[PDB]
């Protein structure tokens, strides 16, 4: 469904629906501040970081250089 | 329904400019801290939000439901 495109979330199996649409804010930002964002422009609740699952399809959450600083 | 971009109301009071940022999809209640839950979770005596905004006293003070439930 078209309405699910560019809502912040992975809906295409390869998250293509987020991958090719504008920034969300004037300061050049793709996601609300209270969340974690991935290089394909999907963004997710913070606790998904390094939980063991590639939650945004680019897998930026599971790149360990993030949670080297998270207990 | 309030604060979701979809102008459900004709006069436009449904969507003010002082509206907080919406995290949840259309149809989902938004907790004050930004969490989401199904509408039936409101005032159900079970803390369904992290901070329990669905269980705030003011939200339940004059709660009502349809003719088929007691
Ligand atoms: C690009 O631009 C966006 C905004 O367009 C930035 O995101 C904002 O970042 C700021 C700073 O973190 C956020 O401001 C803070 O929000 C907290 C939460 O309140 C929000 O959510 C509630 C939910 O009920 C709403 O009611 C409310 O209106 C807000 O939307 C506040 O608690 C914070 O207040 C505290 O700090 C301030 C000082 O900053 C004090 O004055 C207060 O007393 C208090 O201590 C604060 O207001 C803002 O909410 C963010 N908005 C969004 C949409 O995310 C990005 O950070 C920015 N990104 C980049 C990379 O530049
Ligand atoms: C949806 O619901 C979930 C829970 O199911 C929320 O999770 C909480 O998120 C908040 C932040 O939004 C977390 O608060 C952080 O707590 C850190 C310390 O933890 C103690 O205090 C918290 C309560 O604040 C307790 O929950 C916890 O048990 C501990 O007692 C702080 O260090 C953090 O500070 C952050 O901001 C300051 C000020 O800018 C910075 O200096 C810090 O570096 C840091 O960035 C923060 O306050 C809280 O711990 C989470 N709780 C749980 C149980 O997960 C989600 O956030 C919510 N979804 C969204 C989108 O908001
Ligand atoms: C992203 O889109 C926003 C919409 O508010 C702004 O137009 C912003 O200038 C855009 N940034 C870029 C680099 O295109
Ligand atoms: Ca999407
Ligand atoms: Ca993850
Ligand atoms: Ca509305
Ligand atoms: Ca509840």
DSSP B44-64: SSS--SSS-GGG-HHHHTT--
Task: Supply the residue whose CA is at minimum distance from atom 26 of ligand 2.
Answer: B50
Place of tokens 């003719």: B67
Count of Cβ atoms closer than 10 Å to residue A60 Cβ:
19
- CB contacts, 8 Å: A34 with chain B: 23, 34
Q: Can you tell me whether residue B39 is helix, strand or coil?
A: helix
Q: How far is CA A38 from CA A70, B32, B64, in A?
A: 17, 25, 42
**R_g of chain A computed on alpha carbons:** 12
Experimental method: cryo-EM
Q: From the CB of residue A9, how many other CB atoms can be counted at a distance below 10 Å?
A: 15
Dist. CA A32 → ligand 3 center (Å): 14
Region for B33 from its dihedrals, namely left if φ exceeds 0, alpha if ψ lies in -120 to 50, beta otherwise: alpha
Burial class (CB in 10 A: 0-12, 13-18, 19+), A41: buried
Token digits for A5?
Answer: 């495109």
Integer CA distances (angstroms), B54 to B39, B40, B64, in order: 9, 10, 14
Q: What is the resolution of this structure in A?
A: 3.8
For chain A, give the number of residues: 71
- Closest Cα of chain B to A29: distance in Å? 14
Question: A33 CA to middle of ligand 2, Å?
Answer: 13
Coarse DSSP helix, strand, coil percentages of chain A, rounded to the nearest 5 percent: 15, 5, 80
Phi-psi region of A37 (alpha: psi -120 to 50; beta: other; left: phi over 0): beta
Please tell me whether residue A44 adopts helix, strand or coil conformation: strand
Vertex A33: Cα angle to B38 and A47 (nearest 5): 60
Work out whether the CA dihedral B30, B2, B39, A53 comes out positive or negative: negative
Strand partners, A43: A37
Would you say A24 and A30 are in contact if contact means Cβ atoms under 8 Å apart? Answer: yes
Total residues belonging to chain B = 70
| Token pair of A31 as six digits | 């996601």
Ligand 2 atom at minimum distance from B23 CA: 60
Q: Which residue lies with its CA nearest to atom 10 of ligand 3?
A: A23
Instruction: Name the closest residue on chain B to residue A9, using Cα atoms.
Output: B25
| Two tokens, residue A38 | 């991935």
């Amino acid at each position: 469904p078209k309405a699910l495109a560019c809502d912040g979330r992975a809906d295409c199996l390869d998250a293509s629906d987020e991958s090719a649409c504008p920034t969300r804010f004037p300061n050049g930002t793709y996601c609300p501040a209270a969340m974690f964002e991935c290089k394909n422009h999907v963004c997710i609740q913070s606790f998904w970081i390094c939980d063991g699952e590639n939650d945004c399809v680019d897998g930026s959450d599971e790149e360990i250089h993030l949670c080297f600083n998270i207990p | 329904w309030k604060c979701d971009g979809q102008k459900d109301c004709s006069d436009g009071s449904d969507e003010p400019d002082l509206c907080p940022h919406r995290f949840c999809r259309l149809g989902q209640f938004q907790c004050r801290d930004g969490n989401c839950t199904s509408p039936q979770a409101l005032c159900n005596a079970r803390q369904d939000c992290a901070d329990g905004s669905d269980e705030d006293r003011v939200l339940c003070e004059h709660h009502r439901c349809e003719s088929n439930e007691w």
